[PDB]
Structure 1
Amino acid sequence: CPICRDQKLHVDFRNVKLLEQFVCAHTGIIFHAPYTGVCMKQHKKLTQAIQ
Structure 2
Amino acid sequence: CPICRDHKLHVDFRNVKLLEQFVCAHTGIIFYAPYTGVCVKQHKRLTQAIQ
Please classify the TM superposition score into its range, dividing by the shorter chain length: over 0.9
- TM-score scaled to structure 2, two decimals? 0.98
Aligned-residue Cα RMSD (Å) equals 0.3
Shift of 1:2: 0.2
Structure 1, unpaired ranges of 5+: none
Q: Deviations over 1:15-45 (max 9, x none)?
A: 1100000000000000000000000000000
Structure 2, unpaired ranges of 5+: none
Q: Which runs of 4+ in 1 moved over 2 A?
A: none
- TM-score scaled to structure 1, two decimals? 0.98
Aligned to 2:9: 9
Distance 1:36 1:11 in 2: 14
SS of 2:21's equivalent in the other structure is: helix
% identical aligned pairs: 92
